[PDB]
Scaffold this active site. Structure first.
Site, short mmCIF file in Angstrom:
data_model
loop_
_atom_site.label_atom_id
_atom_site.label_comp_id
_atom_site.label_asym_id
_atom_site.label_seq_id
_atom_site.Cartn_x
_atom_site.Cartn_y
_atom_site.Cartn_z
N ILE C 30 0.83 -1.20 -0.17
CA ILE C 30 -0.01 -0.08 -0.01
C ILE C 30 1.01 1.15 0.19
CG2 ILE C 30 -1.95 -1.12 1.15
CD1 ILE C 30 -1.20 0.11 3.62
N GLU C 32 5.01 3.07 1.04
CA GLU C 32 6.29 2.97 1.71
C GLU C 32 6.65 4.38 2.58
OE1 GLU C 32 9.23 2.87 -1.49
OE2 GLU C 32 11.08 2.69 0.00
N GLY C 33 7.97 4.38 3.33
CA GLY C 33 8.04 5.46 4.25
C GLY C 33 9.37 5.32 4.42
N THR C 34 10.02 6.61 5.03
CA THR C 34 11.29 6.89 5.44
C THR C 34 11.77 5.46 6.49
OG1 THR C 34 10.67 8.25 6.99
CG2 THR C 34 11.48 9.14 5.05
N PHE C 35 10.67 5.36 7.58
CA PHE C 35 11.04 4.36 8.67
C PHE C 35 10.54 2.89 8.28
CE2 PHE C 35 11.80 8.37 10.70
CZ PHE C 35 12.94 8.28 11.36
N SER C 36 9.52 2.83 7.32
CA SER C 36 9.00 1.56 6.99
C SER C 36 8.11 1.45 5.84
CB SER C 36 7.92 1.45 8.00
OG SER C 36 7.14 0.00 7.78
N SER C 37 7.79 0.19 5.17
CA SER C 37 7.28 -0.20 4.16
C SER C 37 5.93 -0.69 4.59
CB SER C 37 7.97 -0.88 3.16
OG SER C 37 7.22 -1.46 1.93
N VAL C 38 4.73 -0.23 4.08
CA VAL C 38 3.74 -1.03 4.75
C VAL C 38 3.12 -1.83 3.73
CG1 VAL C 38 1.50 -0.68 5.88
CG2 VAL C 38 3.10 0.93 6.18
N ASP C 154 4.83 14.13 14.32
CA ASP C 154 4.41 13.97 12.83
C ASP C 154 3.09 13.95 12.47
OD1 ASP C 154 4.52 13.75 10.12
OD2 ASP C 154 5.37 11.71 10.01
N1 LIG Z 1 -3.63 1.12 8.45
C1 LIG Z 1 -3.15 1.69 7.14
N2 LIG Z 1 -3.81 1.48 6.02
C2 LIG Z 1 -3.38 1.98 4.92
N3 LIG Z 1 -2.40 2.51 4.74
C3 LIG Z 1 -1.56 2.72 5.89
C4 LIG Z 1 -2.06 2.30 7.26
N4 LIG Z 1 -1.06 2.73 8.08
C5 LIG Z 1 -0.01 3.44 7.46
N5 LIG Z 1 -0.18 3.32 6.00
C6 LIG Z 1 0.66 3.80 5.18
O1 LIG Z 1 1.82 3.95 5.51
C7 LIG Z 1 2.62 4.98 4.77
C8 LIG Z 1 3.67 5.52 5.42
O2 LIG Z 1 3.91 4.58 6.58
P1 LIG Z 1 3.63 5.29 8.13
O3 LIG Z 1 2.65 4.41 9.02
O4 LIG Z 1 3.14 6.69 7.88
O5 LIG Z 1 4.94 5.46 8.63
P2 LIG Z 1 6.23 5.78 8.36
O6 LIG Z 1 6.87 4.84 7.41
O7 LIG Z 1 7.14 6.21 9.50
O8 LIG Z 1 6.00 7.03 7.56
P3 LIG Z 1 6.67 8.29 7.72
O9 LIG Z 1 8.12 8.41 7.20
O10 LIG Z 1 6.72 8.84 9.11
S1 LIG Z 1 5.63 9.78 6.31
C9 LIG Z 1 1.65 6.03 4.15
O11 LIG Z 1 1.29 6.22 2.97
C10 LIG Z 1 0.06 5.34 4.70
O12 LIG Z 1 -0.86 5.57 3.73
MG LIG Z 2 6.29 7.75 10.44
#
Ligand SMILES: Nc1ncnc2c1ncn2[C@@H]1O[C@H](COP(=O)(O)OP(=O)(O)OP(O)(O)=S)[C@@H](O)[C@H]1O
Ligand SMILES: [Mg+2]
Ligand SMILES: [Zn+2]
Ligand SMILES: [Zn+2]
Ligand SMILES: [Zn+2]
Lengths: 291, 47, 402, 140
Positions: C30, C32-38, C154
């Site tokens: 769904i 990706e992110g700096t700290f994680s890939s969901v 954030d």
């Molecule tokens: N429950 C969820 N359902 C759908 N998408 C999700 C869900 N939780 C997180 N995401 C997606 O996760 C992506 C980024 O992961 P985050 O959960 O925001 O954590 P992160 O990787 O630390 O992100 P940053 O770097 O702080 S933006 C975003 O595009 C969200 O849409």
């Molecule tokens: Mg985050």
């Protein structure tokens, strides 16, 4: 980018490599390097070596880290840092001092320790590389070895008294008694040719106050070479070592010491009256570590 | 090999993710379950 | 249909976790992110789908989002995120922790999948009432988070997931969410900024210039967050940080919708973002803001287009952001921005009567929207309104249906 | 210059920016963000750099992108028109507030006025110390 002119040293890359070496070095690396893998014991040769050393220096309040240069050969990322340190001791050791300060700050902050950060930040940390490549005696060094990190081994014969080396020159106005404090720069102090005060601009009003300047310890030590290899027909040699600001009086006459330091050359003035230097330079060693 | 950045686990900067995760210190950190202790409460606290 | 390079990533997640072959079937990635890939995954066996049914959005079939936290994250930070996701469950606007699994250095956080639209797609087209619903849901989520008493540093359009057709959203990221600790272990002690316990002349000024070789340590305060949503209190290093800053991150998004510009602030540096805040407000406002945290601001010789610019208000700001837009022609014919533009042409002077009283509807909505927008955009931390008071403002007079 | 410091002088100054006058030239790129407005959702500080929205080559893009993007925005408009809460959507069809500012559609009709057959990295970082030694600054 942005390497230093005249050197292969890049501040960013050298800092990163030395920090990685400090955070991730274990003595089993050197035991593997020295083909001594069957002496490897899991208890003390599998702990981060320099992390423990940094913690001990933080607890004890000391400021000097004794870096074994050969350790840099054990680590893969610092295989080039060893040659950079040997070839360019000044820049590399400055970067290592800065990296030690950053490393200790990171150790305190990242692990959330109770230790105060004020006295860490204001402390000057120093690195003492000692176990650099031992060869070439002292007489086999060519002018291409000037300003390189060399390792001598010998006997201490004599040591001059503590010589004051001026670091800050304190001037005083003969008219308005206004004082500036000039900093030394590569052995040259810019004497003011005018009082910087806007009220009086007397040209030669400023006079140097010798007893109110800032001085540092310098000592010259007479050493007899005892090299591993002695070419046929030569006689024992004597060299002069220079110790600075904490290593003064650390070596007494009759001591057998292995000294690591920078092989330096200085032009010697022919006479005390005129400013004329001799074309034949005089060689000595700036001591950075004594074993 | 464009992946490069810091690693809060090993406290070292790497130019390549596929060589940091296979490095000595990272493997030693991962194999040590004492580091991953508070998360171990959650794995079976929910289950 | 799936691109080939993501197949290696999912087979890596299968290999790296020996026990995840069942109980989870990954369908897609769904986000990706700096700290994680969901990763979008189906639930093979129904524990967290049969449970947690209140939390799931019943928009189509229900799936589950597993957050594969990147390996480089410290164990304490992963524990922080997971623990704070744990303590706040039972709420429909938080995306709470359905499951978690740790193998070696890899941690998966399984939270309900929430179908959402990215902000950058619908920000321009959102009507004023839609902006109101957005801000209402965001403020409800922030109200719960702040009642729990932690700072979700954030707060950004990406970290608030909002389904338009269901018209509600959830706050998802918490990796950078700091927890506030007590004020004491009316502007005398909360914000002289004394924290770090370091609060306890002749010839030198230290106001007209800085020392050439400084022997003082810089302040160390939390800077976790996102470019362009950092509050003034987190832009100038200030300890004693409070939840108030997240309220600021609510306004910027509210400012992004009104003006149809998503990247509100470039914010390349902390100084750069602070000077960006000088252009919309003015040097004097920023200096008087700094004088509160015990810090002094100073800037001169700079060619600012308007000194103390946009003083009429943020109203004139969005009007210029709309002026360049309504002169060149960057808006469509079916645009929603023209309503705001014609309402600022009211506020600035520079049958069919649903026309007239929908006219009155959207105008009253805009008039109160700018009021909440300026309560969010306040320099003073204490006198800034909290989430509860911000939600009680008469702009949100659609909460009676509860 | 820009200079943010601590009045207590207990901490090191946070902002110390000092620009020479020749750096203040070339107003296309300043070392600091002078407010710019921009258009089409641009970050206000970012300008339309190497972008001329008045170029028809650009115009046949934005209007046409708006033609394919039309009814997604029509659906969203009809879904968020009357009530902020979307649970009372089902109920003349579309109402609009009249305007007179020219448009992408109006621009494209103008370009047919004027041109067509007619004239005119990872996310974390190491913890570095704040105090820089004199030698390290000299090496810079
Ligand atoms: N429950 C969820 N359902 C759908 N998408 C999700 C869900 N939780 C997180 N995401 C997606 O996760 C992506 C980024 O992961 P985050 O959960 O925001 O954590 P992160 O990787 O630390 O992100 P940053 O770097 O702080 S933006 C975003 O595009 C969200 O849409
Ligand atoms: Mg985050
Ligand atoms: Zn004088
Ligand atoms: Zn690692
Ligand atoms: Zn403060």
């Amino acid at each position: 980018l942005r390497i230093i002119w005249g050197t292969n040293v890049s501040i960013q890359e050298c800092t990163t490599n030395f920090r990685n070496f400090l955070m991730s070095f274990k003595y089993k690396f050197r035991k593997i390097l020295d083909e001594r893998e069957e002496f490897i014991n899991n208890t003390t040769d599998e702990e981060l070596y320099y992390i423990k050393q940094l913690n001990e220096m933080r607890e004890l309040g000391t400021s000097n880290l004794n870096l074994d240069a050969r350790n840099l050969l054990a680590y893969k990322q610092t295989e080039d840092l060893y040659h950079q340190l040997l070839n360019y001791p000044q820049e590399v050791i400055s970067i290592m001092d800065q990296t030690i300060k950053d490393c200790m700050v990171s150790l305190i902050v990242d692990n959330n320790l109770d230790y105060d950060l004020d006295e860490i930040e204001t402390k000057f940390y120093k690195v003492r590389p000692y176990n650099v490549g031992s060869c070439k005696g002292m007489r086999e060094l060519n002018p291409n070895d000037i300003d390189k990190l060399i390792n001598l081994k010998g006997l201490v014969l004599r040591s001059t008294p503590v010589i004051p080396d001026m670091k800050v020159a304190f001037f005083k106005c003969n008219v308005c008694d206004h004082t500036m404090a000039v900093e030394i720069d590569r052995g040259v102090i810019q004497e003011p040719a005018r009082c910087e005060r806007i009220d009086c601009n007397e040209p030669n009003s400023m006079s140097l106050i010798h007893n109110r300047c800032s001085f540092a310890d310098k000592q010259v030590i007479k050493l007899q070479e005892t090299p591993d290899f002695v070419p046929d027909g030569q006689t024992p040699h004597s060299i002069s070592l220079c110790v600075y600001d904490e290593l003064v009086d650390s070596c007494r006459a009759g001591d057998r010491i292995e000294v690591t330091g920078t092989f330096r050359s200085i032009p010697i003035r022919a006479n005390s009256r005129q400013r004329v230097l001799k074309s034949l330079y005089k060689t000595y060693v700036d001591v950075v570590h004594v074993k | 090999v464009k992946n490069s950045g810091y690693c809060e686990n090993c406290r070292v900067k790497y130019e390549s993710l596929e060589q940091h995760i296979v490095s000595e210190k990272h493997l030693s950190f991962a194999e040590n379950d004492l580091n991953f202790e508070a998360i171990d409460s959650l794995i079976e606290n929910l289950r | 249909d799936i691109p080939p390079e993501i197949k290696e990533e999912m087979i890596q997640l299968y290999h790296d976790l020996p026990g995840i072959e069942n109980e989870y079937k990954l369908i897609d990635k769904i986000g990706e992110g700096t700290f994680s890939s969901v990763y979008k995954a189906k639930d093979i066996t129904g524990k967290i789908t049969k449970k947690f049914a209140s939390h799931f959005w019943n928009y189509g079939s229900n799936y589950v989002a597993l957050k594969k936290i990147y390996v480089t994250s410290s164990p304490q930070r992963i524990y922080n995120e997971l623990n704070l996701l744990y303590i706040m469950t039972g709420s429909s606007r938080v995306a709470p922790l359905c499951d978690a699994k740790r193998v070696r250095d890899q941690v998966i956080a399984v939270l309900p999948y929430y179908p959402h639209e990215e902000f950058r797609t619908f920000y321009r087209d959102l009507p004023i009432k839609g902006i109101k619903k957005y801000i209402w849901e965001l403020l409800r989520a922030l109200k719960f988070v702040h009642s729990k008493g932690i700072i979700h540093r954030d707060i950004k359009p990406t970290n608030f997931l909002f389904n338009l057709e269901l018209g509600r959203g959830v706050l998802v990221d918490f990796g950078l969410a700091e927890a506030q600790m007590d004020y004491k272990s009316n502007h005398e002690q909360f914000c002289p900024c004394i924290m770090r316990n370091q609060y306890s002349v002749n010839g030198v000024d230290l106001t007209k210039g800085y020392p050439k070789n400084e022997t003082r340590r810089i302040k160390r305060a939390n800077r976790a967050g996102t470019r362009g949503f950092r509050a003034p209190e987190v832009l100038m290093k200030c300890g004693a940080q409070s939840t108030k800053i997240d309220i600021w991150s609510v306004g910027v998004i509210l400012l992004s919708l009104l003006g149809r510009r998503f990247p509100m602030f470039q914010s390349l540096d902390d100084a750069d973002s602070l000077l960006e805040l000088c252009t919309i407000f003015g040097w004097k406002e920023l200096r008087k803001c700094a004088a509160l945290h015990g810090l002094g601001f100073e800037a001169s010789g700079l060619i600012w287009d308007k000194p103390n610019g946009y003083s009429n208000g943020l109203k004139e700001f969005v009007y210029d952001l709309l002026n360049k837009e309504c002169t060149i022609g960057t808006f469509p014919e079916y645009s929603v921005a023209f309503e705001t533009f014609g309402f600022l042409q009211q506020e600035l002077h520079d049958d069919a009567y649903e026309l007239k009283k929908y006219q009155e509807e959207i105008w009253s909505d805009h008039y109160w929207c700018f009021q909440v927008l300026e309560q969010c955009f306040e320099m003073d931390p204490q006198k800034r309104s909290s989430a509860e008071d911000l939600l009680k403002t008469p702009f949100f007079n659609e909460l009676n249906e509860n | 210059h820009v200079y943010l410091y601590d009045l207590w002088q207990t901490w090191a100054p946070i902002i110390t920016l000092e620009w020479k006058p020749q750096e203040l030239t070339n107003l296309d790129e300043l070392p600091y963000p002078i407010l710019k407005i921009g258009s089409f959702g641009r970050c206000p500080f970012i300008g339309d750099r190497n972008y001329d929205e008045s170029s028809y080559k650009r115009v046949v893009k934005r209007y046409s992108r708006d033609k394919a993007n039309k009814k997604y925005a029509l659906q969203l408009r009809a879904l968020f028109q009357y009530h902020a809460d979307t649970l009372l959507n089902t109920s003349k069809n579309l109402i609009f507030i009249p305007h007179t500012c020219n448009d992408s559609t109006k621009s494209f009709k103008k370009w047919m006025q004027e041109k067509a057959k007619n004239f005119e990295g990872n996310g974390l970082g190491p913890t570095r110390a704040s105090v820089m030694s004199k030698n390290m600054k000299s090496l810079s």
